[PDB]
Ligand binder design. Structure first.
Ligand SMILES: CN(Cc1cccc(F)c1)S(N)(=O)=O
Ligand SMILES: [Zn+2]
Ligand SMILES: [Zn+2]
Length: 582
């Protein structure tokens, strides 16, 4: 315990030596508590005026307007240690899964060079405000990298000074850039080298993109078996056990030299022991520790979640096929049976799943899976919104399965080629596009974010009548050459100034491995929509009076936004649609 966290604690204690107060009205049972010190301050969500002015009908839809306004008693919960048979099932499965993932990959260190280019084009890594302002600055100064070297040589010693979590079912723990770097050095390879790609991992979809996920679920649907199962876990990050963290760390068994020692230190000193600074209003800072749960960086969290989820689901599949009889204790003939199952059918059983971090779809061999709940509940992966021992509901149609906040439609083009397109309730799509994160944004920055949403809609949601119209209207109201932007970048093919019809053709035809005929599409009118009734089912306003006035007078809304931005070069995209083409 305190040998490993103490140094980190001693250090923070002294940076606030005229504050430290061992409180006894501290709200922690599950989190160990060490003391407190003085602090003050707080980050809300702003409306994007460009998107809102061009989506007026939605100004009266509460599902949209409410999204822009605004359980930490789930972080203070506790999960029992699995039984011995569960622990054996998990260790055997984890050992076998790292081997399979490593068959065609070489673990390796990520570089300062790599880390630096990352910071300069942004994929929200999670830094702090203070010695430097942004992370952009700290990365150019060689002082920083001496801070990073001091800590690096400490980790090689088996000690930690500065790797401390900052807390704010969404709980996000930011660290100072230097600790993020050391995390990236050691584990970045999982993401950077695509360990959870579908080609490499069979269950994974890392790098896949929203235009590929539907085709993937459909491929899983082809497999002979029972229903498709899509159980969400109640607070996945909060149910990661010390035993889960030890099975993840076995990736170090695949490493060597310095790398191996660097990865071991991250696992031992920052994941399997943790120090967090939490802001308490009654406003002070509480310095609390615990061994279990998830608090890596967002990107390592994703790969380790995918790994442990693949593992849980192969085991749930094992329980459904009667590979083992009780989680209480595995016999020796049962270890032999588990191992031989993995060797004989493990790759086939991985190909029956689509797993994105904590999210999964499984098409098991048959419907025994639905009531195979003992290992899943004993690993602590307790299902959301169903009684502990009530069997899982199954989906009989792959176009009804929820995955990554979406469902997928099968859509036949006038020439017979088949698109599998992503979809979610349209109020959700319009409500997110109306929101900007952070403040201090020019009218040009706001316009360029609107343009990003519009281009995403044209590429992923072209089949929704209201989104194709609104996308053409936003792209008509923002200057033709202004570059789309984002502040927390799935593959993002809409982030470009290329012609959207040209990107559509590349994404949906040329690069789509499910399309045998590569004949390009010549205009947007070749590109189909969902059926009118399906469009309404998924939240369209077609048939409403508000919507008919909006569409008919769209050029007046476009002209309102153009007048606000000013005298710039604009394109009329509205004639790409039949009803505005005269
Ligand atoms: C809502 N329908 C008509 C409609 C109005 C505007 C655009 C459309 F694409 C279709 S309906 N009642 O299903 O025919
Ligand atoms: Zn450290
Ligand atoms: Zn839909």
């Amino acid at each position: 315990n305190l040998d490993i966290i103490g140094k980190r604690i001693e250090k923070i204690k002294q940076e606030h030596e005229t504050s430290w107060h061992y409180d006894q009205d501290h709200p922690y049972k599950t989190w160990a508590y060490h003391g407190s010190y003085e602090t003050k301050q707080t980050a809300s969500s702003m409306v994007n005026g460009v998107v809102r002015l061009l989506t007026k009908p939605w100004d009266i839809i509460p599902m949209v307007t409410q999204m822009a306004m605004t359980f930490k008693e789930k972080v203070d919960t506790r999960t029992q240690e699995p039984k011995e048979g569960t622990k054996k099932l998990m260790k055997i499965t984890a050992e076998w899964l790292w081997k399979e993932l490593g068959k065609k990959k070489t673990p390796r260190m990520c570089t300062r060079e790599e880390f630096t280019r990352k910071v300069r084009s942004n994929a929200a890594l999670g830094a702090i405000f203070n010695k430097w302002k942004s992370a952009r600055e700290a990365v150019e100064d060689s002082g920083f990298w001496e801070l990073v070297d001091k800590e690096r040589n400490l980790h090689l010693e088996g000690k930690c000074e500065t790797c401390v979590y900052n807390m704010m079912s969404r709980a996000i723990w930011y660290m100072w850039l230097g600790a993020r770097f050391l995390e990236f050095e050691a584990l970045g390879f999982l993401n950077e080298d695509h360990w959870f790609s579908r080609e490499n991992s069979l269950s994974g979809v890392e790098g896949e993109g929203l235009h590929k996920l539907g085709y993937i679920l459909r491929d899983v649907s082809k497999k002979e078996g029972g229903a498709m199962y899509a159980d969400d876990t109640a607070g996945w990050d909060t149910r990661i056990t010390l035993e889960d963290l030890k099975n993840e760390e076995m990736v170090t068994n695949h490493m060597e030299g310095e790398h191996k020692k660097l990865a071991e230190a991250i696992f031992k000193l920052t994941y399997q022991n943790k120090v967090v600074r939490v802001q308490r209003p009654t406003t002070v800072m509480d310095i609390i520790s615990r061994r279990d749960q998830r608090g890596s960086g967002q990107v390592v969290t994703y790969g380790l979640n995918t790994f442990t989820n693949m593992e849980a689901q192969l085991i749930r599949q094992m329980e459904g096929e009667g590979v083992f009889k009780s989680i209480q204790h595995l016999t020796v003939t049962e270890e032999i049976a588990v191992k031989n199952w993995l060797v004989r059918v493990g790759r086939e059983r991985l190909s029956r799943m689509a797993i994105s971090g904590d999210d999964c779809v499984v098409k098991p061999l048959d419907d025994r899976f639905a009531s195979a709940l003992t290992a899943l509940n004993d690993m602590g992966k307790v299902r959301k919104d169903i009684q502990q021992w009530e069997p899982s509901r199954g989906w009989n149609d792959w176009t009804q399965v929820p995955f990554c906040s979406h469902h997928f439609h099968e859509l036949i083009m006038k020439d017979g080629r088949v698109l599998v397109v992503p979809c979610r309730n349209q109020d959700e799509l319009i409500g997110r596009a109306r929101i900007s994160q952070g403040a201090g944004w020019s009218l040009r920055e706001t316009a360029c974010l609107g343009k990003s949403y519009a281009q995403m809609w044209s590429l992923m949601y072209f089949h929704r009548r209201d989104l194709r119209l609104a996308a053409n209207a936003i792209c008509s109201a923002v200057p033709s050459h202004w570059v789309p932007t984002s502040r927390t970048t799935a593959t993002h093919e809409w982030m470009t100034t290329e012609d959207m019809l040209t990107v559509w053709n590349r994404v949906w035809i040329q690069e789509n491995p499910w399309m045998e005929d590569k004949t390009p599409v010549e205009s947007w009118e070749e590109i189909p929509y969902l059926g009118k009734r399906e469009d309404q089912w998924c939240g369209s306003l077609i048939g409403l009076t508000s919507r008919a006035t909006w569409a008919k007078n769209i050029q007046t809304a476009i002209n309102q936004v153009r007048s606000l931005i000013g005298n710039e070069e604009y394109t009329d995209y509205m004639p790409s649609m039949k009803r505005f083409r005269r």
